[PDB]
Ligand binder design. Structure first.
Ligand SMILES: O=C(O)c1ccc2c(c1)CN(Cc1nc(N3CCc4ccc(Br)cc4CC3)no1)CC2
Ligand SMILES: O=C(O)c1ccc2c(c1)CN(Cc1nc(N3CCc4ccc(Br)cc4CC3)no1)CC2
Lengths: 140, 140
């Protein structure tokens, strides 16, 4: 099956976390979501105490990024980790889709919006209600 | 002169902005800070209206990142742009120094802390009072 790498802020708030779950749920229809092979707590979702070591989280993520056929990033919440994953993914020449919610009232980083080229790196603005449909449009 | 690339959150708060200025001021002693060749407003410091286009900001930053001998990043505020710049810099095999203030009460992203190798990628925790001394220690 196609290998998918999902990324979002490890400190995402309630609305962001509900959306990461809906996104990962829909991505399962199209391929293997590598990033769900370990518990969210082990990657840091419940704080430093439940997390694995920083070096292990970095190495595991770089291994998954290299195995992935497509990178899907939810870029609504500012995150060094998501940005770093996107930087490494661009340099690996990965097919990348960024999903951004303008209704958050945020302005997406010019470094992410400016990386878009309409083909291998796309940034799609969306509203919460249509995220599954947009994933279907991308992965059809 | 050695070419230095500085990066910090374009949405950094008051304390972060005072520190970026002190850092760039001290870096001038060691080399050319490429990132000050354009006004902070043009990179987005005063909002989208005064900023240049996203693609121009991305391309200008990638050109400066490739010309740089050392990348210095202040990673206290979560930022997709700073993370992305760090990802691209790692893949360009740049010498990188990240400066993080634990007194902010934040926990630095495991993707940045886990990228450290003690040599080409270092993460130094600091308190505001010693930032100039630590830059002297790094660049001596
Ligand atoms: O924000 C950071 O600085 C940061 C630091 C480390 C990591 C990353 C970011 C992202 N990496 C890739 C990745 N994202 C994800 N999802 C799904 C799991 C999940 C559940 C609940 C919450 Br609340 C947040 C999350 C995170 C998003 N699964 O894998 C993992 C390591
Ligand atoms: O946070 C982001 O998502 C993001 C988006 C775009 C850019 C970046 C980040 C960072 N890039 C490299 C860079 N940083 C900087 N400094 C100094 C200038 C300055 C003054 C005041 C404030 Br308040 C903030 C800043 C920014 C830090 N000079 O060049 C430029 C483009």
């Amino acid at each position: 099956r196609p290998a998918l790498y999902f990324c979002g802020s490890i400190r995402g708030g309630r609305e962001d976390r509900t959306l990461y779950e809906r996104i990962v749920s829909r991505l399962r229809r199209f391929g293997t979501v590598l990033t769900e092979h370990v518990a969210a707590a082990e990657l840091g979702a419940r704080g430093e105490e439940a997390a694995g070591g920083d070096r292990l989280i970095h190495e595991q993520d770089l291994e998954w990024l290299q195995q992935a056929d497509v990178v899907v990033a939810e870029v609504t919440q500012p995150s060094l980790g998501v940005g770093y994953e996107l930087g490494r993914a661009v340099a690996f020449n990965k097919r990348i889709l960024c999903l951004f919610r303008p209704q958050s009232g945020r302005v997406l980083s010019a470094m992410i919006r400016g990386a878009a080229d309409g083909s291998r790196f796309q940034v799609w603005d969306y509203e919460e209600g249509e995220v599954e449909a947009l994933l279907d449009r991308y992965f059809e």
